[PDB]
Design a protein around this ligand. Structure first.
Ligand SMILES: *[C@@H]1O[C@H](CO)[C@@H](O)[C@H](O)[C@H]1NC(C)=O
Lengths: 49, 42
């Protein structure tokens, strides 16, 4: 009585349209705190004379 | 914000003589610290 399972499956099939096909999403979030900030980013280099 | 460990190894109470200690590890941890304890191998 007005009670249903909140979770239902995707049920994906190849015939589905572009707007219904699966899409993998990745979210990158950066956090800066009171730490020496290990992850920085690449630094280039040049030949020495 | 850095934890620094220096060390030295020597062959032989604490004896006489002089010997300097070289850096071994610097660690980027940054945790507040107040107390410590050791371990044994029984
Ligand atoms: C260690 O120091 C920080 C900053 O001064 C403080 O926020 C924290 O409460 C201290 N640790 C303890 C166990 O009190």
């Amino acid at each position: 009585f007005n009670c249903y399972f909140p979770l239902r499956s995707y049920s994906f099939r190849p015939t589905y349209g572009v707007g219904h096909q699966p899409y993998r999403v990745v979210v990158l979030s950066f956090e800066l705190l009171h730490a020496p900030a290990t992850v920085c980013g690449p630094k280039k280099s040049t030949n020495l004379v | 914000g850095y934890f620094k460990i220096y060390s030295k190894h020597t062959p032989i109470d604490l004896p006489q003589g002089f010997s300097a200690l070289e850096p071994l590890v610097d660690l980027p941890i940054g945790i507040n610290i107040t107390r410590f304890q050791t371990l044994l191998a029984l």
